[PDB]
Design a protein around this ligand. Structure first.
Ligand SMILES: *[C@@H]1O[C@H](CO)[C@@H](O[C@@H]2O[C@H](CO)[C@@H](O[C@@H]3O[C@H](CO[C@H]4O[C@H](CO)[C@@H](O)[C@H](O[C@H]5O[C@H](CO)[C@@H](O)[C@H](O)[C@@H]5O[C@H]5O[C@H](CO)[C@@H](O)[C@H](O)[C@@H]5O)[C@@H]4O)[C@@H](O)[C@H](O[C@H]4O[C@H](CO)[C@@H](O)[C@H](O)[C@@H]4O[C@H]4O[C@H](CO)[C@@H](O)[C@H](O)[C@@H]4O)[C@@H]3O)[C@H](O)[C@H]2NC(C)=O)[C@H](O)[C@H]1NC(C)=O
Ligand SMILES: Cn1c(C(=O)NC2COC2)cnc1COc1cc(Cl)c(C#N)cc1C(C)(C)C
Ligand SMILES: [Ca+2]
Ligand SMILES: [Ca+2]
Ligand SMILES: [K+]
Ligand code: NA
Ligand SMILES: [Zn+2]
Length: 802
């Protein structure tokens, strides 16, 4: 209950709440059924519309008008945005030439350039080129400011996950807004876009920008706009706030547009009906920039024009129905559409089986347009698992499709021609970034980047210290003229041991066997002491950022950091030149495993455990196939180079090592490879401590990895060899799930040449993702700036067309 007969007089769009039961005149009051009786009359004026006409110039103020053309309007801060154009012979901001903003040009009393975030729902990246003819304001922002060809949203590519990611710098798994609908099980509560539940603060984790600002003494405008407030009024409201006195004026503001998403769902992303929504958003940008320019703020404010997600062609007929797969389809609840999430209709059902549900959805029809996953098996790049609101069973749905429980769900709601929410790598889901203002660069194109990165930058733009987030602070310094964040490298926590030969062969009882001139006797000593190390370790040794015991082992062909705790390398580094030769594992060396006389029996793996473990086999991190010489090949069979591998997974690994490494070296003019295990048994994206490991090689202390990674680096200028590169680098990385079956790959019964590389592409990763999962820090010794390296560590190779 509210006493909704106080008044909004003098308080329209007041910046602080007032506590029920006073009545409200802030922006949310509609949404809580709580505005004062006179809110619409006083605060939502519409009389005479939104534009000055010659006949209104110098009018007598009439307080009923929506905006003013009276001589007093600039000082009252409430002119129509086109007032100076119509009534003082001024030019529209869009008609003015682009002129570099080297320094903020602000009115007196401004402590810092304000930031305006202008968010557009469903604004797909390719609209910047495809709609360029009808968005002149937007195109000027883009060509004169700083822009990316596109910005990568987070998964799922839905509105609230992506805008709350923008505001927090956090993955949805961490901020808690994991879809446009959710069910929390420890709230028996359901979040939806409709309704009032979404407004409860319990859903919304992390620390959004407006709170970071407020806590550090910087005031914020509203970020949520009620749907019934028209855009023209949202803009006038921002401009009025900007005329407040210094002690009261916000420094950060947001404007949100429901378009073009709203029309896109109806008409498809490039429907003829889409030209007009783009025209209209452009006009609204025009109103803001003309308003800023009247208030002498157009060379003072930093503007970010950003989208939440794109839009794809999706229709009712492209719907897969779980009823066509399952018989038990009334025992489940599906969160449906462009992704699926499945749980049990009732948790008084000890006879509901995830395993049987997954099997019943796996590779069941030849062109099946979704793929089931347990959430912990989803590609690690999606970061979509470590939250109780994300159901254990997930369906990744093909672009252009939907999933539904039963047909009646689809005709008892074709309506719609567009949708979004697919995998964030999909071209049609990419969205936009433009930064314009004194703090951004002038006429600069930057590479595509992820929206998780923007919170740090917005904090930098406002002089705020960011709360802990998933951005990599520094990775976007190249967007900025000034206000850059001087990142430094994390300190190494554990220093390596450098063991020599300390053990005689007979001290080992590992149950292994192998079948095994003075000029090249010094030669091999030199190799075991790190003579080839400049070649195989090109960017320094990775730093270990936690407390552990590990040894650097040198070899002719590869260098490794060997963990005494996990009994296997944390990392193994090797360089394959364009000219390198692939060779086989000789018949006599098929089962060869050799004790390493540098490492104690008690810190070694053993072959018996692998013999006794009927599920578990082993592979090698430096591949024997890429040995430089028959003699060097013996090094690849050291027990220190061995890692546990499911036979099923060995098919993937062997193909990668035997065929694909050499392909990449030939295509990229050599490659440096760093490979290793990852342990993420609690699927939190972070390196497991050893007491978190849930699986060991039977009857041993050898832990089984959940994943294997590789980082593959070369020269960006591919005319230079990887090992003699003078300038910027090029990387691609992956985090492959270490699974005992290849059920993920529907074509796995075929030759590896038809499915393996497809799997690896799906599991493409950023170097930064591997950093989180290993506690390692890469690229510590290069000739590049640290900022550039941070950019490199955030790169994702997406394997999409353009
Ligand atoms: C992306 O960036 C983010 C942000 O930096 C990274 O997330 C951080 O990860 C840290 C490590 O996992 C984590 O630190 C823990 O936090 C506990 C304090 O938690 C509360 O307070 C903070 C501060 O204001 C708050 O942010 C937290 O918010 C979470 O919880 C609420 C729900 O209750 C949500 O509204 C919100 O969205 C957020 O949810 C997310 O995080 C939780 C975990 O915190 C997940 O479960 C959710 O799914 C969701 O993702 C909290 O309100 C603190 O108590 C922890 O300390 C214990 O744990 C460690 C052992 O690992 C140990 O050192 C301590 O001694 C202690 O042990 C004792 O507690 C154990 C557990 O109760 C118990 O088992 C033991 O036996 C002991 O009793 C710990 O410090 C930090 O909170 C999150 N922050 C966020 C915002 O998510 C994320 O890792 C990054 N991702 C990548 C991939 O890099
Ligand atoms: C999405 N939205 C709606 C909306 O969906 N209305 C629907 C339900 O009724 C019709 C209304 N106003 C907004 C803008 O919100 C934001 C904007 C920005 Cl720029 C940022 C940031 N950073 C964050 C948000 C939040 C507050 C979502 C987190
Ligand atoms: Ca949206
Ligand atoms: Ca973990
Ligand atoms: K075995
Ligand atoms: Na298969
Ligand atoms: Zn939408």
């Amino acid at each position: 209950w509210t006493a909704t007969s106080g008044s909004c007089k003098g308080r329209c769009f007041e910046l602080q709440e007032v506590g029920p039961p006073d009545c409200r005149c802030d922006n949310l009051c509609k949404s809580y059924s709580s505005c004062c009786h006179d809110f619409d009359e006083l605060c939502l004026k519409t009389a005479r519309g939104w534009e000055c006409t010659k006949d209104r110039c110098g009018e007598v103020r009439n307080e009923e008008n929506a905006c003013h053309c009276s001589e007093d309007c600039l000082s009252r801060g409430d002119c129509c945005t086109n007032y100076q154009v119509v009534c003082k012979g001024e030019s529209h901001w869009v008609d003015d030439d682009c002129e570099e903003i080297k320094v903020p040009e602000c009115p007196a009393g401004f402590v810092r350039p304000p930031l305006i975030i202008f968010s557009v729902d469903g604004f797909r990246a390719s609209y910047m080129k495809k709609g360029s003819k009808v968005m002149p304001n937007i195109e000027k922002l883009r060509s004169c400011g700083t822009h990316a060809p596109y910005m990568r949203p987070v998964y799922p590519t839905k509105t609230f996950p992506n805008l709350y990611t923008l505001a927090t710098g956090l993955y949805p798994e961490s901020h808690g807004i994991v879809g446009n609908s959710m069910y929390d099980p420890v709230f028996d509560a359901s979040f939806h876009l409709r309704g009032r539940e979404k407004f409860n603060h319990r859903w919304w984790g992390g620390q959004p920008l407006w709170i970071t600002a407020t806590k550090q003494g910087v005031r914020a405008g509203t970020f949520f706009w009620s749907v019934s407030i028209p855009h023209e009024r949202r803009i006038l409201t921002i401009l009025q706030w900007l005329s407040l006195p210094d002690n009261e004026r916000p420094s950060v503001y947001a404007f949100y547009s429901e378009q073009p998403d709203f029309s896109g769902h109806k008409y498809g992303p490039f429907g003829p009906e889409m030209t007009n929504p783009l025209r209209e958003i452009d006009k609204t940008v025009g109103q803001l920039m003309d308003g800023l320019k009247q208030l002498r703020l157009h060379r003072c404010v930093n503007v970010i024009f950003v989208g939440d997600h794109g839009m794809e062609d999706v229709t009712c007929d492209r719907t897969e129905f779980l009823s066509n797969y399952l018989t038990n389809v009334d025992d489940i609840t599906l969160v449906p559409g462009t992704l699926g999430r499945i749980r049990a209709k009732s948790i008084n059902n000890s006879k509901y089986d995830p395993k049987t549900i997954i099997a019943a959805l796996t590779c069941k029809k030849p062109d099946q347009h979704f793929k089931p996953y347990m959430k912990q098996h989803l590609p690690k790049r999606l970061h979509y698992a470590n939250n109780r609101r994300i159901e254990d069973i997930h369906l990744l749905v093909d672009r252009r499709w939907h999933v539904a429980r039963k047909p009646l769900d689809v005709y008892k709601k074709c309506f719609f021609q567009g949708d979004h929410g697919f995998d964030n790598k999909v071209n049609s889901m990419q969205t936009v970034f433009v930064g314009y203002g004194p703090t951004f660069k002038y006429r600069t194109k930057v590479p595509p980047f992820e929206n998780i990165e923007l919170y740090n930058v917005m904090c930098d733009l406002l002089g705020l210290k960011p709360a802990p987030n998933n951005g990599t602070h520094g990775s976007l310094n190249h967007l900025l003229r000034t206000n850059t964040f001087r990142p430094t490298m994390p300190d190494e926590v554990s220093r390596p041991n450098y063991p020599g030969i300390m053990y005689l062969q007979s001290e080992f009882d590992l149950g292994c066997t192998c079948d095994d001139n003075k000029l090249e006797e010094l030669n091999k000593r030199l190799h075991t002491k790190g003579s080839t190390k400049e070649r195989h370790l090109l960017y320094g040794r990775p730093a270990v950022l936690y407390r552990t015991s590990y040894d650097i082992l040198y070899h002719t062909d590869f260098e490794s950091g060997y963990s005494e705790i996990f009994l296997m390398p944390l990392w193994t580094s090797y360089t394959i030149s364009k000219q390198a030769e692939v060779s086989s594992i000789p018949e006599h060396l098929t089962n060869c495993v050799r004790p390493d006389v540098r490492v104690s029996p008690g810190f070694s793996q053993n072959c018996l455990a692998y013999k006794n473990d009927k599920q578990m086999s082993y592979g090698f991190l430096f591949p024997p196939y890429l040995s430089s010489s028959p003699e060097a090949k013996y090094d690849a069979f050291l027990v220190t180079n061995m890692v546990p591998m499911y036979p099923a997974f060995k098919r993937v690994w062997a193909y990668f090592q035997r065929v694909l490494v050499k392909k990449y070296a030939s295509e990229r003019n050599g490659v440096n490879v760093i490979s290793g295990p990852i342990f993420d048994y609690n699927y939190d994206g972070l390196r497991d401590t050893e007491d978190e490991i849930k699986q060991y090689v039977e009857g041993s202390s050898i832990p089984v990895p959940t994943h294997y990674y590789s980082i593959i680096t070369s020269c960006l200028d591919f005319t230079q060899p990887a090992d003699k590169c003078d300038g910027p680098l090029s990387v691609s990385s992956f985090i492959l799930p270490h699974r005992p079956d290849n059920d993920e790959s529907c074509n796995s019964s075929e030759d590896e040449s038809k499915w393996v590389e497809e799997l690896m592409k799906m599991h493409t990763a950023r170097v930064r993702d591997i950093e989180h999962l290993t506690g390692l820090d890469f690229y510590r010794k290069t000739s590049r700036s640290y900022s550039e390296i941070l950019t490199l560590k955030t790169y994702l190779h997406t394997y999409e067309s353009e």
